[PDB]
Amino acid sequence: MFDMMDAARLEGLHLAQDPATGLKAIIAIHSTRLGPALGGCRYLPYPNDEAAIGDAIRLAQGMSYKAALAGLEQGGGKAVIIRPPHLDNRGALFEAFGRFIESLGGRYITAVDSGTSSADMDCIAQQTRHVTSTTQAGDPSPHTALGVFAGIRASAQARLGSDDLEGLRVAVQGLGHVGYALAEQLAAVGAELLVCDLDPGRVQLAVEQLGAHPLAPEALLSTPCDILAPCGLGGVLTSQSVSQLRCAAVAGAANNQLERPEVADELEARGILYAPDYVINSGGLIYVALKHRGADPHSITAHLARIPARLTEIYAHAQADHQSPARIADRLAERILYG
Amino acid sequence: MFDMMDAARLEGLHLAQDPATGLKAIIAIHSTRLGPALGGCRYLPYPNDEAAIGDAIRLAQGMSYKAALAGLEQGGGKAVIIRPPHLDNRGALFEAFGRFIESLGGRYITAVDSGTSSADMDCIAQQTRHVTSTTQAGDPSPHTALGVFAGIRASAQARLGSDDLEGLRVAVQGLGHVGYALAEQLAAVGAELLVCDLDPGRVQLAVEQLGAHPLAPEALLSTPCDILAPCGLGGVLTSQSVSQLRCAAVAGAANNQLERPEVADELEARGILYAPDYVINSGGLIYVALKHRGADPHSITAHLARIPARLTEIYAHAQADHQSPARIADRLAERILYGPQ
């Protein structure tokens, strides 16, 4: 596994296995230069171990970049639990996972992610305090939503010339907690709002309560609009979908929007501004992390307020270098993490 | 690596890589049921990662069995550090390893092993307290030899009716730090002491200083004797060598005496009592474990008694169950490690 670690420049890898509870856990710690590593925990089926390990490692490197550009005193980590087929007692499984976390003594702080819920974080909390997004904690989705909204304002400024959004066509792909909250902000501002989601009744709510113009999901990604906001599954941007984009900029809340790093040059080569997902969507991370360390309230507002400004700066550097803003963000992150 | 870990019932595997220092290190924590996990750090070349990782797993398991039968509030762990082809320098790497150990909060305590020395322990000592066998710490070889001595006395009783070694023929195969100290302990008991070793002066030393009979290195394992004490290389017990033995028991200090577990049964078939190596040679481990926790010399002696006590317990169940002592030992260990308590 050292080859995998070395390719990601991952500091440490930890595997725990416990047959009383069926726990098979991976905690990957990519960086702790800036602080303890924080990252969510996934509870998912996997074709095999090396896929689960590989997924934890790559995602943990993602967190280091996201935390580094959000200016936090936080490194990147990620946990992955391999979903059993049987499972008699989930909950007792997550209590073992919390003991696993404890054994690393605060080097890793956990969080929610695909397949886990604040329910499971409550069980984790029984065994360690290096956990966040408990049921007692908030739902941090609003902070993500407002961050991306700020970031869409900044992308329209850089790409179209004005940060005014009224009458702009903006397409919001996905109406989960974050996607709907973003759409709602967009309707209040008077954007021409286009929405899509797999749940037909989520779309109905957005048509009924936001005045959203509904679109089929296959059509949404290529409709002509000013700004496309991906807020669903990852990998939404492929070489294929980038060739059929009709927006002037891509700016959304979803994680891991780029299928491959190479796609960011396909976007720039078409002249479409791309807001690097891990910059524009960090609001949920900034709030959870600062609240978890008990930071000063002035510091929390200050960090959240910096997201659009960070985008502006990136956007300037990318212009000044005829480079994709994803390249600019990456190299910024590398210097912080590896300089 | 979960198939491996599940096979070995390994709690936890940990990996750290540091390209600045060249650290590629594995720490395998098999069990922490009886206490924090204690185990040597080996520093060796390896053909591939899967080889080193699998090594760490398998040795940490053995250490859990060894610590359990030794009666210690200790778990089993092992560190493996893949030796890079070109390194400058050593001390920085082991300082980085020291930081790796410290990151586990005392759940793992390291020690010297094949490839590492007390000097490397000294560098680890700069970054963590969870390290043993530094230069300032007392040699553990005497204690190993003393524990093997007591173990031999308990094999005499079980095999020959009493623990009196006076006038017994005991052949010691290997006269290193542990080897010779066992030989010295045996002469004083009043036993007829046969010896072999790769260095000849080692022999005439024991011949001169102990009354030993010099024996040819290549024919010691077949000489008529009451007890054979392997204190050299591992794997001296093979299907072939067991066929040629001319002793009543085997009880010595060497690690990994059994070339593979069948040998235990071939020894049972021949009626030769076999002292499970990792039980009889636990004395270095007991001493280091207890010193680290700061124990009085009385407490070390009492705990050292676990070797003869446990060997006697194993010999009794072995008789009652009509099984090899090697099999009894593993099942007792498993009872302690994975059973209820």
The answer to whether A106 and A38 are in contact (CB under 8 A) is no
User: Measuring CA to CA, how many Å separate B13 from each of A31, B22, B44?
Assistant: 19, 20, 19
Residue B243, burial from CB neighbour count under 10 angstroms (0-12, 13-18, 19+): exposed
Residue A14, chain B, CB below 8 Å: the answer is yes
8 A C-beta contact, residue A169 and residue A147: no
Q: Which residue has the tokens 């059973």?
A: B339
φ, ψ of residue B340 to 5 degrees: the values are -90, 145
Instruction: Answer positive or negative: Cα dihedral of A87, A92, A96, A101.
Output: positive
Range 40-69 of A in CB contact (< 8 A) with B: 49
Q: Rounded CA gap, A326 and A331, in Å?
A: 9
B1–chain A Cβ distance below 8 A for any pair: yes
- The secondary structure of A243-305 as a DSSP string is HT-B-SEE--S-S--BSSTTHHHHHHHHT-EE--HHHHTTHHHHHHHHHHHT--HHHHHHHHH
Edge-first strand listing for the sheet containing A169-173: A213-214, A192-196, A169-173, A227-230, A249-250, A273-274
Spatial separation of the C-alpha atoms in residues A306 and A279, rounded to whole Å: 10
The answer to whether the Cβ–Cβ distance between B1 and A5 falls below 8 Å is no
Phi, psi of B9 (to 5 degrees): 60, 40
- Could you tell me if A94 and A120 are in contact, meaning their C-beta atoms sit under 8 angstroms apart? yes
Q: B6 vs A12: CB contact, 8 Å cut-off?
A: no
DSSP class of residue A131 equals B
Beta-sheet strand order (sheet of B213-214): B213-214, B192-196, B169-173, B227-230, B249-250, B273-274
Determine whether the interchain pair A6/B17 forms a contact, defined as Cβ–Cβ distance below 8 Å.
Answer: yes
Output the six-digit token pair for B330: 């593993």
Residue B194 has, within 13 A of its CA and on its CB side, a CA count of 21
Say yes or no for a CB contact (<8 Å) between A1 and B3: no
What span, in angstroms and rounded, lies between the C-alpha atoms of B144 and B150? 10
Using what technique was this structure determined? X-ray
DSSP A110: B
Assess A130–B contact: CB distance below 8 Å, yes or no: no
Check whether B71 is labelled as a binding-site residue: no
Q: Is the dihedral of CA A269, A272, A277, A278 positive or negative?
A: positive
A276, A308, B137, B170, B221 from B246: Cα distances, Å: 77, 85, 40, 12, 8
Residue type, position A335, single letter: R
Name which of A13, A17, A33, A99 to mutate to probe chain B: the one with the most chain B Cβ atoms within 10 A of its Cβ.
A17
Residue position matching structure tokens 């009451």: B226
Report which residue type is found at A108. Answer: Y
- CA trace torsion A149, A153, A154, A158 (10° rounding): 140
Q: Which residues, 6+ apart, have CB-to-CB distance to B2 below 8 Å?
A: A15, A17, A24, A49, A82
CA distance B321 to B327: 10
Identify which of A103, A121, A104 has the alpha carbon closest to the alpha carbon of residue A112.
A121
Three state DSSP letters for chain B: CHHHHHHHCCCEEEEEEECCCCEEEEEEEEECCCCCEEEEEEEECCCCHHHHHHHHHHHHHHHHHHHHHCCCCCEEEEEEEECCCCCCCHHHHHHHHHHHHHCCCCCEEEEECCCCCHHHHHHHCCCCCCECCCCCCCCCHHHHHHHHHHHHHHHHHHHHCCCCCCCCEEEEECCCHHHHHHHHHHHHHCCEEEEECCCHHHHHHHHHHHCCEECCHHHHHHCCCCEEEECCCCCCECHHHHHHCCCCEECCCCCCCECCCHHHHHHHHCCCEECCHHHHCCHHHHHHHHHHCCCCHHHHHHHHCHHHHHHHHHHHHHHHHCCCHHHHHHHHHHHHHHCCC
Rounded to whole angstroms, the Cα distance separating B28 from B82 reads 14
How far apart (Å, rounded) are the C-alpha atoms in residues B113 and B290?
A: 18
Q: What are phi and psi of A278, to 5 degrees?
A: -80, -15
Q: Is B6 on the interface with A (CB under 8 A)?
A: yes
Report the distance separating Cα A226 and Cα A165, nearest Å: 10
Type of residue numbered A28: A
- Chain B residue nearest residue A16, CA to CA: B12
B234 in A contact zone (CB under 8 Å): no
* Residues 6+ positions from A7 with CB-CB distance below 8 Å: none
Other beta carbons within 10 Å of B213: 16
- DSSP category for residue A74: -
CB atoms within 10 A of CB B317: 15
B121 inside 8 A of chain A by CB: no
Return d(Cα A95, Cα A85) in angstroms, integer: 19
The 3-state DSSP class for residue A87 equals coil
Q: In this structure, what are the phi and psi dihedrals at residue A70, rounded to the nearest 5 degrees?
A: -75, 0
The whole-angstrom distance between residue B292's C-alpha and the CA centroid of its chain comes to 18
B82 touches chain A (CB under 8 A): yes
Cβ–Cβ contact A30 with B under 8 A: no
Which positions in chain B touch A16 (Cβ < 8 Å)?
Answer: 11-13
Q: How far is A43 from chain B (nearest CA, A)?
A: 16
Chain B residues with beta carbon closer than 8 angstroms to that of A9: 19
User: Mapping DSSP to helix (H, G, I), strand (E, B) and coil, where does residue A129 land?
Assistant: coil
Amino acid at A114: S
**Chain A CA closest to residue B4:** A17
Nearest beta carbon to residue A14 from set B14, B19, B24: B14
Q: Give me the amino acid identity at A177.
A: H
Q: How many angstroms separate the CA of residue B8 from the nearest CA in chain A?
A: 11
Catalytic positions of A, written as ranges? 78
User: Looking at the partner chain, which of A2, A18, A100 has a beta carbon nearest the beta carbon of B24?
Assistant: A2
State the smallest CA–CA distance between residue B59 and chain A in angstroms. 17
Nearest CA in chain B to A6: B17
Place of tokens 């400024």: A157
Residue A102 tokens, joined: 């404890």
Resolution in A: 2.5
Angle between helices B141-160 and B297-304 (to 10 degrees): 30
Contacts of A14 in chain B (CB under 8 A): 12-15
Location of structure tokens 């700004």: A227
Please tell me what DSSP assigns to residue A163: -
CA dist list (Å): A288 to A47, A131, A294, B231: 31, 10, 10, 60
Residue B172 labelled as part of a binding site: no
DSSP string of A182-231, one letter each residue: HHHHHHHHT-EEEEE-SSHHHHHHHHHHH--EE--HHHHTTSB-SEEEE-
Backbone phi, psi, residue A189, to 5° = -70, -15
Q: How many CB atoms lie within 10 A of CB A8?
A: 20
